[PDB]
Amino acid sequence: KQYKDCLRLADIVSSENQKLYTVFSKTEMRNLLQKLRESSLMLLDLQLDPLGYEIQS
Amino acid sequence: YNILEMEYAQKRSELLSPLLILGQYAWASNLAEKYCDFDILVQICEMTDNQSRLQRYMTLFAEQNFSDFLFRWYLEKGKRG
Amino acid sequence: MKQDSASNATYTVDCEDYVHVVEFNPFDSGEAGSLLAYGGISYVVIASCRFQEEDSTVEGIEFKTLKTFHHGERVVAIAWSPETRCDALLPLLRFATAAGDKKIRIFTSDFQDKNEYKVIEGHSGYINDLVFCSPEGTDIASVGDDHTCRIWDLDGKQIAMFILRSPGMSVAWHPEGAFKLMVAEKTGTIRFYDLTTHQAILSLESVQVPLMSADWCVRNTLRIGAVAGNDWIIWEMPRSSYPQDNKPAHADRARMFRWSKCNENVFATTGYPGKMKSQIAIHHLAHPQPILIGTAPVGSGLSWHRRLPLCVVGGYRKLFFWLTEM
Structure with missing residues (x-):
């Protein structure tokens, strides 16, 4: 239920100190982004913006 | 012509609010569907939770801009999921 | 039949006095707690207002009267x-x-x-x-x-x-x-x-005729909105000498036009509480119908929060708060 960590996985992948972005094909990272979509979705159903702990809108 | 239409619109809106406050769901539905009123049928059909007639009216009024009020009332009722 | 939109105030503060007028700050004074001033026949009160956003020490609304002056x-x-x-x-x-x-x-x-x-x-x-x-x-x-x-x-x-x-x-x-x-x-x-x-x-x-109220956009001094006759109007100076936006403000007699002091596109026009309970309608730019409408048994005075989109109206022994968010 700690989807905030699922979302931090995006930054962990973005780390160019380990360059996790390059080793993803289109389909792989598309599955990853849909997994992130799912993880964001549950917290977002809790009436909280997916950008930060508070609402941005 | 548009002045008459708009003024007619708000006037019967306030005319017709009270028994909507009071209930009488079947008759509200009958009259509102007879004269084609989207939002009122919406808000009644979701405080009755009848998603089925929700789709049936969406199909009926696809050309009548049902979905705008659908998205709106969704937004005010905080089920953005 | 049809009904448009109405609701009960997002927040409500009890009062032992009527509220003729109630107003926040147009510009920030350097306080997190939003200063609020309301006046009547018997008392005029300055206070700090807070609505819950963080911490469980604050529940719902906290209203701390900074000072109250005996009035007549x-x-x-x-x-x-x-x-x-x-x-x-x-x-x-x-x-x-x-x-x-x-x-x-x-x-x-x-x-x-x-x-x-x-x-x-x-x-x-x-x-x-x-x-x-x-x-x-x-x-x-x-x-x-x-x-x-x-x-x-x-x-x-x-x-x-x-x-x-x-x-x-x-x-x-x-x-x-x-x-x-x-x-x-x-x-x-x-x-x-x-x-x-x-x-x-x-x-x-x-x-x-007649003009009832007007308001600059706090974020756009060049944008002016107002209420006249029954409708809210908008100029964008200095490229106007006649109204360029003209859309109905209320089914009621529009009394005050105000701008939300958080945004550049949010404003309010208040309806007149005559026979029927005052309508409060928050509109938006490029959207003629108001985004939010609420009902208040008595409506006298309308204001917007210093830095946030909240519109306030005070009436008989009650103070109604509408939190407009997106």
Whole structure:
């Protein structure tokens, strides 16, 4: 239920100190982004913006 | 012509609010569907939770801009999921 | 049959007195807790308001009366100095009030040590509105049912005169301060006076009678909205001399036009509580229908939060808060 960590996985992948972005094909990272979509979705159903702990809108 | 239409619109809106406050769901539905009123049928059909007639009216009024009020009332009722 | 939209206030504060007028700060004074001032026959109260956003120590709403003054008059209008400041050990609060005696009172407070007011000559009739026409709070511009725009110093000496051909209702200082004074008249005209040269630099022309209220966009001084006749209108100066936006404001008699002091596209037009409960309608730019509509048993006075989109109306023993969010 700690989807905030699922979302931090995006930054962990973005780390160019380990360059996790390059080793993803289109389909792989598309599955990853849909997994992130799912993880964001549950917290977002809790009436909280997916950008930060508070609402941005 | 548009002045008459708009003024007619708000006037019967306030005319017709009270028994909507009071209930009488079947008759509200009958009259509102007879004269084609989207939002009122919406808000009644979701405080009755009848998603089925929700789709049936969406199909009926696809050309009548049902979905705008659908998205709106969704937004005010905080089920953005 | 059909029904449009209505709801109960997002927040409500109980009161042992009626609320003739209630207002937040137009500019931030340096306080997280939003200062709120409300007046009546018996009492005029300054307080700090908070609504829960963080911490469980705050539940719902917390309202802390900073101070309450014994009154004996119905408050007509109140204008704080555009110089907003509360960050000191003894913050200094400066504002002007109108009562039923057709007089102007410069009320100043020094935070729990003293509270003073000065006697300033008023209008032959009631003063419709008044602002501080100086970005620090030393000169006061007042307009009333006597078609005279009177500029007074802090002493109560009438600094300047602007003659009108119809009772001047609304006066507005430049929110930032450029000697610009907006004048809104009942026929629907807008006249900009330069306090340095005592002449009009610009004007917006309309004939839709009557004009009830107007408001600059706090984030766009060049954008002006207003309520006239039954409808809210919008100019975008200086490319206008006739209204460029004209959409209905209420099924009710629109009384005040106000801008939300968080955004550049959010405003409110208030309906008149006559026979039926006052309608409150928050609109949006490029969207003619109001985004939100609520119902209040009594509606008198409407304001917007200093930095956030919250619109407030005070009535009989109650104070209603509408939190408009996106």
